[PDB]
Amino acid sequence: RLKVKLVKSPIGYPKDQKAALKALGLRRLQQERVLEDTPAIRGNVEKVAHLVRVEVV
Template identity: 55%
Template sequence: MLKVKLVRSVIGCRADHRATVRGLGLRKLQSTKVLQDTPSIRGMIETVRYLIKVEEVKS
């Protein structure tokens, strides 16, 4: 499991990066989501790594 937190604003970002953040389930600044650790989620995280903070969660 991965804990993903939006730490930078999506204002001024590319439209596809905004869509990726939305796809991760993050809406407002400082919002947090716990997601499954899958290759597709990892790819999305890699795309917008400059906007988010990620940490592993023990389940």
Template identity: 50%
Template sequence: MATIVVKQIGSPIRRPAIQRETLKGLGLNKMNRTRELEDTPSIRGMVAKIPHLVTIIEEKS
């Protein structure tokens, strides 16, 4: 199973509620936190919606 490591690089302060909820859905809530998540189309879509708040730092296959 492929995974990606996602790091939060931006603050959700003064962002729309949907962007804050997307961060929570990814399991992120504080600056510089990282999460290892499954590489699925839904996760990729969530990351694509908030590219200014998160970055993919590693892709594992």
């Protein structure tokens, strides 16, 4: 499982990166979600790597 925390604001970033955060359920700064490590989920995690911090739990 992956633990993903939103640490940088998506203001000013392209709409596809905003949509990737919505697909992951990250809506607030510093919000923390535990998601399953599957390629479909992981693909969106990589897309917004510069905005989030990822840990394995």
